[PDB]
PDB file of C-alpha atoms and ligand atoms in Angstrom:
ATOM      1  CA  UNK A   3      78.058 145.064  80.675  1.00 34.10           C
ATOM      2  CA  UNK A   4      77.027 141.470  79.476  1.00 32.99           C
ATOM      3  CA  UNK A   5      73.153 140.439  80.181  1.00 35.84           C
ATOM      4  CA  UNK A   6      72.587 137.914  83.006  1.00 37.79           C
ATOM      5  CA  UNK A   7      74.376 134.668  81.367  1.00 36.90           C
ATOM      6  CA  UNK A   8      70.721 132.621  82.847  1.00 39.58           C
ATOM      7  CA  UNK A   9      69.168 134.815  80.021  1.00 37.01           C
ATOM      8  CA  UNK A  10      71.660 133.868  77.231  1.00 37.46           C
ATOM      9  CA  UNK A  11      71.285 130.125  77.331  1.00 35.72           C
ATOM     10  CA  UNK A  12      69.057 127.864  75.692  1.00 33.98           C
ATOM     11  CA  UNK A  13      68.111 124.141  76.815  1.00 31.33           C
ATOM     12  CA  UNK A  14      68.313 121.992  74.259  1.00 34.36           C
ATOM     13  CA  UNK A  15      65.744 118.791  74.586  1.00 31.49           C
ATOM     14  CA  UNK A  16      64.683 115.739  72.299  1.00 32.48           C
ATOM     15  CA  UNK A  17      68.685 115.657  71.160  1.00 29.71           C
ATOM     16  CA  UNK A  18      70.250 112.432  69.017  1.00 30.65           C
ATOM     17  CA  UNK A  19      71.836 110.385  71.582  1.00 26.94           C
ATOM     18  CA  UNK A  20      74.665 110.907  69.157  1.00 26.48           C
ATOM     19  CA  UNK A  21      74.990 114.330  69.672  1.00 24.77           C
ATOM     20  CA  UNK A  22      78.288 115.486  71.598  1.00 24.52           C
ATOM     21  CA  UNK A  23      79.658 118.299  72.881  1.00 25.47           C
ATOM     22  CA  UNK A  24      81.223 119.297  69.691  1.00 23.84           C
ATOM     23  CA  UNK A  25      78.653 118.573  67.157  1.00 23.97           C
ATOM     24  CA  UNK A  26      75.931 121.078  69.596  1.00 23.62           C
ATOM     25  CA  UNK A  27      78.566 123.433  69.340  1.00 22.74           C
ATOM     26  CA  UNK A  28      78.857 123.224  65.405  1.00 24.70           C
ATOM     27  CA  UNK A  29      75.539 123.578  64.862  1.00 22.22           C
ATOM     28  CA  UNK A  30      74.420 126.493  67.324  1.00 23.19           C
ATOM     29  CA  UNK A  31      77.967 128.285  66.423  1.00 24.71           C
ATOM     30  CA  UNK A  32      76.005 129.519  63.188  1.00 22.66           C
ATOM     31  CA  UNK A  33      73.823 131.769  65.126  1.00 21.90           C
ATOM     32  CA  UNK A  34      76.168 133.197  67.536  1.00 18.55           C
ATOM     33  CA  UNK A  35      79.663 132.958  70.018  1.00 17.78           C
ATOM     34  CA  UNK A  36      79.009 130.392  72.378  1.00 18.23           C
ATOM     35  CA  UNK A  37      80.666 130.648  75.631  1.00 18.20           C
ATOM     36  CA  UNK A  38      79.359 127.367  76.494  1.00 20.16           C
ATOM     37  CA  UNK A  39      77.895 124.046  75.261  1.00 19.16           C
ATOM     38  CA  UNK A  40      76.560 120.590  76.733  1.00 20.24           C
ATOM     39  CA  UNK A  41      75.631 117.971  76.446  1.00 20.45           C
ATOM     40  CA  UNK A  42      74.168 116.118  79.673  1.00 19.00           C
ATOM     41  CA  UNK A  43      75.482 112.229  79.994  1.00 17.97           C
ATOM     42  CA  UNK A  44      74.876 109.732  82.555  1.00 12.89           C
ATOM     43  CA  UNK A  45      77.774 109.511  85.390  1.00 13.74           C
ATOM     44  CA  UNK A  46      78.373 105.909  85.016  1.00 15.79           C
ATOM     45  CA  UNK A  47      77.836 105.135  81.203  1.00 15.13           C
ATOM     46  CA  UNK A  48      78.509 107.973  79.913  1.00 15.50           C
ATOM     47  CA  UNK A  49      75.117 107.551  77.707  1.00 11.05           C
ATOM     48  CA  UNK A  50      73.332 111.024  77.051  1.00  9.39           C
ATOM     49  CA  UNK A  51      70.353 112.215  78.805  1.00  8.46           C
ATOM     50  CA  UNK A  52      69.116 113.706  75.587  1.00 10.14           C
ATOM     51  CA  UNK A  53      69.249 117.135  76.572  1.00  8.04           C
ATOM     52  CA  UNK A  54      71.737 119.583  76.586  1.00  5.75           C
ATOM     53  CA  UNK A  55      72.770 123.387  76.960  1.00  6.11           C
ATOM     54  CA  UNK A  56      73.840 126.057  75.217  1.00  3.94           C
ATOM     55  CA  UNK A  57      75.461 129.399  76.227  1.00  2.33           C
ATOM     56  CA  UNK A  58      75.242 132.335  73.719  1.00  3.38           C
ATOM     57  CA  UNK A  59      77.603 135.634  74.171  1.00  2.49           C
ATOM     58  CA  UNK A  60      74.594 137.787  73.955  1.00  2.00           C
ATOM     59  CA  UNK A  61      70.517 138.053  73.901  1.00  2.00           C
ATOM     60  CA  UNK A  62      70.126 138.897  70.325  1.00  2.00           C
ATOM     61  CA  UNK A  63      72.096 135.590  69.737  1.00  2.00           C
ATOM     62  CA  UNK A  64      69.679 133.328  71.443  1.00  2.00           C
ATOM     63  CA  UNK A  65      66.894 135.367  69.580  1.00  2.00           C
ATOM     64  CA  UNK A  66      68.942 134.195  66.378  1.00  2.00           C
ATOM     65  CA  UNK A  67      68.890 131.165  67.220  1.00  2.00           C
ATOM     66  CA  UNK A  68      65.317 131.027  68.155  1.00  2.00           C
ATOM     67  CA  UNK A  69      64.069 132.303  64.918  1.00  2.00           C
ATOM     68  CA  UNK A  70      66.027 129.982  63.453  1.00  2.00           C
ATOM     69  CA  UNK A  71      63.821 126.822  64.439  1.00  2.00           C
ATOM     70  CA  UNK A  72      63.066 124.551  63.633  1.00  2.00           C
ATOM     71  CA  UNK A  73      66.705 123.241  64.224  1.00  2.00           C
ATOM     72  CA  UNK A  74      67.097 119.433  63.303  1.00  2.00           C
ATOM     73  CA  UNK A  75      70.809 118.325  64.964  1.00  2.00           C
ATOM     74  CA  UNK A  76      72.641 115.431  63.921  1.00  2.00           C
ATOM     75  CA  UNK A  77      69.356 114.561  62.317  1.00  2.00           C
ATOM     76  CA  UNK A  78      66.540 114.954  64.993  1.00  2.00           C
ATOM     77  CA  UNK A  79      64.509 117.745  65.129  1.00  2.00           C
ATOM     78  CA  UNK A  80      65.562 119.549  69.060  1.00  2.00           C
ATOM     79  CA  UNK A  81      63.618 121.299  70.946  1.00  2.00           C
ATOM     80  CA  UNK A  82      65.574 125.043  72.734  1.00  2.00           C
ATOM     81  CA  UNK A  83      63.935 126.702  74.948  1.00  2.00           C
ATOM     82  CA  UNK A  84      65.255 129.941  77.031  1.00  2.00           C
ATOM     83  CA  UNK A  85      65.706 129.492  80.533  1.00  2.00           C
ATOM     84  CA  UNK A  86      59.908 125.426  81.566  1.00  2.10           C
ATOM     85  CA  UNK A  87      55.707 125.969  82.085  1.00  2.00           C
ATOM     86  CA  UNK A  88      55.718 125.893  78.626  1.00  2.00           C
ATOM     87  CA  UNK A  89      52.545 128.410  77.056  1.00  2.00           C
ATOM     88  CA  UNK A  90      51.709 130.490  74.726  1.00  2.44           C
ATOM     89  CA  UNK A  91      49.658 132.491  76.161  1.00  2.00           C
ATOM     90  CA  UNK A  92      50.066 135.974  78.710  1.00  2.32           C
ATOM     91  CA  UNK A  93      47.712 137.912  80.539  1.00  2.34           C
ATOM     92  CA  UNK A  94      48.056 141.654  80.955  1.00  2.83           C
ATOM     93  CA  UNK A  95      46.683 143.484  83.606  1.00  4.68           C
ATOM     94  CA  UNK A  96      46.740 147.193  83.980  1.00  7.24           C
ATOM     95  CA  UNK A  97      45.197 148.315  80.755  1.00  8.51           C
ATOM     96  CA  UNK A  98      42.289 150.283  82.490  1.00  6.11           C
ATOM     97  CA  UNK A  99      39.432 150.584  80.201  1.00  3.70           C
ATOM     98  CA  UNK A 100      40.661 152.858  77.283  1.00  2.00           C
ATOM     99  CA  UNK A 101      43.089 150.260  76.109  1.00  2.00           C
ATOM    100  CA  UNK A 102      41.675 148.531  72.967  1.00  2.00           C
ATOM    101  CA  UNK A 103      43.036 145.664  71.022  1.00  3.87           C
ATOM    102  CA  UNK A 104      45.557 147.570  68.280  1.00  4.03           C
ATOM    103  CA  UNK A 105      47.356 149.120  71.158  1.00  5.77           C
ATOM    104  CA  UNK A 106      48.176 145.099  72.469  1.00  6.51           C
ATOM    105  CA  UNK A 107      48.473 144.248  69.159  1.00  4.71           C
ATOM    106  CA  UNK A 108      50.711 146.921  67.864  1.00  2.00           C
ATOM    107  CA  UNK A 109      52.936 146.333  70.911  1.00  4.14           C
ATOM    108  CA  UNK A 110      52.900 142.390  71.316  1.00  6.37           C
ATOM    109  CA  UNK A 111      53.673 141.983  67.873  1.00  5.13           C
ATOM    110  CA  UNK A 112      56.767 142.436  67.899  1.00  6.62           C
ATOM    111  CA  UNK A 113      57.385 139.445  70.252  1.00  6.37           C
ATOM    112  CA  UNK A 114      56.090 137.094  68.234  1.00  3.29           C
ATOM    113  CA  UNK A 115      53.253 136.004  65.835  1.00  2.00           C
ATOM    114  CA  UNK A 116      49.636 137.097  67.255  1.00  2.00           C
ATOM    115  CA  UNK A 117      46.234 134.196  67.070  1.00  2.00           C
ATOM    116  CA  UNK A 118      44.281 135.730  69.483  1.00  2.00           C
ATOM    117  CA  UNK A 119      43.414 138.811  71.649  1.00  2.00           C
ATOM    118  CA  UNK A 120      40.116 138.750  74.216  1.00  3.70           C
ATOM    119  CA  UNK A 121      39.906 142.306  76.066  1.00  2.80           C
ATOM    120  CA  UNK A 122      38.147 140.940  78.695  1.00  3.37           C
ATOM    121  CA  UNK A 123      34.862 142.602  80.024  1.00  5.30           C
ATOM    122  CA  UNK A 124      32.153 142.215  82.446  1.00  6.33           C
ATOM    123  CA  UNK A 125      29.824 139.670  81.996  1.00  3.98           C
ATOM    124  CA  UNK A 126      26.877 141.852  83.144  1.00  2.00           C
ATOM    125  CA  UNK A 127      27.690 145.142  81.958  1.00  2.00           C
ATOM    126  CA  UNK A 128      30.045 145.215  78.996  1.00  2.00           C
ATOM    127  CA  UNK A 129      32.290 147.347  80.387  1.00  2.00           C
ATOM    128  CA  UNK A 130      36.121 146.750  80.246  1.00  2.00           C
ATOM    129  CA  UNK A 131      37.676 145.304  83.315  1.00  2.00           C
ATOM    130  CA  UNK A 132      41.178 146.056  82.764  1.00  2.00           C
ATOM    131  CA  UNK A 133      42.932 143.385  81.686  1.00  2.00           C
ATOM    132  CA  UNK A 134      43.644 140.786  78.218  1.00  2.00           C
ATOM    133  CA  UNK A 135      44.994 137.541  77.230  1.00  2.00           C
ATOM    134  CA  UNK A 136      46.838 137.511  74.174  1.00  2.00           C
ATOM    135  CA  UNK A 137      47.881 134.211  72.840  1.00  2.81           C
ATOM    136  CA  UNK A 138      50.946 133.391  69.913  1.00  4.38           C
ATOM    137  CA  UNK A 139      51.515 131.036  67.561  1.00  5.28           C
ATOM    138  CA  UNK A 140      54.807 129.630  69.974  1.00  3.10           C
ATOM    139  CA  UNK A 141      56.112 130.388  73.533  1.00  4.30           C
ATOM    140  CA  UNK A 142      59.122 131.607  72.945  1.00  2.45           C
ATOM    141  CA  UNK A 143      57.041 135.055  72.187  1.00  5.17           C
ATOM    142  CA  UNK A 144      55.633 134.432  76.103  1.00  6.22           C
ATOM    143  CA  UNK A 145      59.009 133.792  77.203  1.00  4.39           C
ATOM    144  CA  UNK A 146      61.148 136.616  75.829  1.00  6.87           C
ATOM    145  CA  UNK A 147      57.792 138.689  77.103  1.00  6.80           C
ATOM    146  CA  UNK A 148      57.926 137.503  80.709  1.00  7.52           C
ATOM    147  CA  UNK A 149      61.595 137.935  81.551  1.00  7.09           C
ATOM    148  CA  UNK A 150      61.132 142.053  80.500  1.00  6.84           C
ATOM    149  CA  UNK A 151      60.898 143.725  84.073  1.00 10.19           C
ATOM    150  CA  UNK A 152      58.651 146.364  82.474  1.00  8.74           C
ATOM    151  CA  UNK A 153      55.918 146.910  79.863  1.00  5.78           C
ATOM    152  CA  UNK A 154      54.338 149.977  78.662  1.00  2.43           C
ATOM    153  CA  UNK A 155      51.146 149.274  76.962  1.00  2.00           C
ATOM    154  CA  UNK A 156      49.130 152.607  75.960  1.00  4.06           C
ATOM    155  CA  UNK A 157      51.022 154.797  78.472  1.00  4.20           C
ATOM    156  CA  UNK A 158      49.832 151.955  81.394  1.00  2.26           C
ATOM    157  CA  UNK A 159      52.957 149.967  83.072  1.00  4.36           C
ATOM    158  CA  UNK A 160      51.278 146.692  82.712  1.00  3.04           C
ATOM    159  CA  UNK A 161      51.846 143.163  84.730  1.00  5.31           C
ATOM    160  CA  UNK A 162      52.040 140.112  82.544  1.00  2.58           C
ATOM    161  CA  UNK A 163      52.205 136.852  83.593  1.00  2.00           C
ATOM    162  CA  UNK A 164      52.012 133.508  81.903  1.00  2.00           C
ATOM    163  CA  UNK A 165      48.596 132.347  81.308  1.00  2.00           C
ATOM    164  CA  UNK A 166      47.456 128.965  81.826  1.00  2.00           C
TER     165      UNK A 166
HETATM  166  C1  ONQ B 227      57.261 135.208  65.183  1.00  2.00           C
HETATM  167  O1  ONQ B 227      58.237 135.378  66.203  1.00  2.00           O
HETATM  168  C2  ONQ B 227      58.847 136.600  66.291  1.00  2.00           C
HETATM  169  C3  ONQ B 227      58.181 137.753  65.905  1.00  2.00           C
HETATM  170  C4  ONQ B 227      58.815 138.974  65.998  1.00  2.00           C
HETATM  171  C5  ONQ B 227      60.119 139.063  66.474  1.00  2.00           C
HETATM  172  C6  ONQ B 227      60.840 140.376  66.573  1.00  2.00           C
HETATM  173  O2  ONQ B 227      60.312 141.426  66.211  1.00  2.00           O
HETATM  174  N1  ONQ B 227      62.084 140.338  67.053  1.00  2.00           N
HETATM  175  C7  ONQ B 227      63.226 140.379  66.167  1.00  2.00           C
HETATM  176  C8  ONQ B 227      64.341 139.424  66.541  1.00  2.00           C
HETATM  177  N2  ONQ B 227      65.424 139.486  65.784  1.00  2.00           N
HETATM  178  O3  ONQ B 227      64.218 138.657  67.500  1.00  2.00           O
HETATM  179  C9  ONQ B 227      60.773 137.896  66.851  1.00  2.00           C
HETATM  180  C10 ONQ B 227      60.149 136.672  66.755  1.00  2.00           C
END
């Protein structure tokens, strides 16, 4: 059973207007099988867009390649991102009030790098009010977090959206 392909691709921005088909392939081939690869052109010039695609065989292969960045092609620095409101930052509802920051932190973690975590609580009486933001150091953390259909934070099954 292969994942969803929309999940296995990567778009590729800020490319070399050099770049072809072939040389995105050669580079993003070190980090996985690529069942597909891009680059978009104009219809009448044939000039590129600057962007492109790339198709990987499997998710663990666009998490190679992700933790592989910063990925300079043909000599420009590119800019993947999964299949953009582009943040670094979630919320996460559903923690109820015994939920405390190592139990995010311990989970979240493992997504990506961890700056900040505010357990937010009421402004008049301290008390917890069931739900956090946690931001990362980068957003591909947010987006590998927000395409899970589940989360299990502390025994709650928590929501998490982007934030802001
Ligand atoms: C700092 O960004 C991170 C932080 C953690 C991970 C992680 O645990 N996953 C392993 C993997 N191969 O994808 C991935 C990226």
């Amino acid at each position: 059973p292969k994942e969803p392909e929309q999940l296995r691709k990567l778009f590729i921005g800020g490319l070399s207007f050099e770049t072809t088909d072939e040389s995105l392939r050669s580079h993003f081939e070190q980090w996985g099988t690529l069942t597909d690869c891009v680059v978009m052109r104009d219809p009448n010039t044939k000039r590129s867009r600057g962007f492109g695609f790339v198709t990987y065989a499997t998710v663990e292969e666009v998490d190679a390649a992700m933790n592989a960045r910063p990925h300079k092609v043909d000599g420009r620095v590119v800019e993947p991102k999964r299949a953009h409101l582009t943040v670094k930052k979630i919320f996460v509802g559903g923690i109820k009030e015994d939920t405390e920051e190592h139990h995010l932190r311990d989970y979240f973690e493992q997504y990506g790098k961890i700056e900040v975590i505010e357990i937010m609580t009421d402004r008049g009486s301290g008390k917890k009010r069931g739900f956090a933001f946690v931001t990362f150091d980068d957003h591909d953390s947010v987006d590998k977090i927000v395409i899970q259909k589940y989360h299990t934070v502390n025994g709650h099954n928590c929501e998490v959206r982007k934030a802001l």
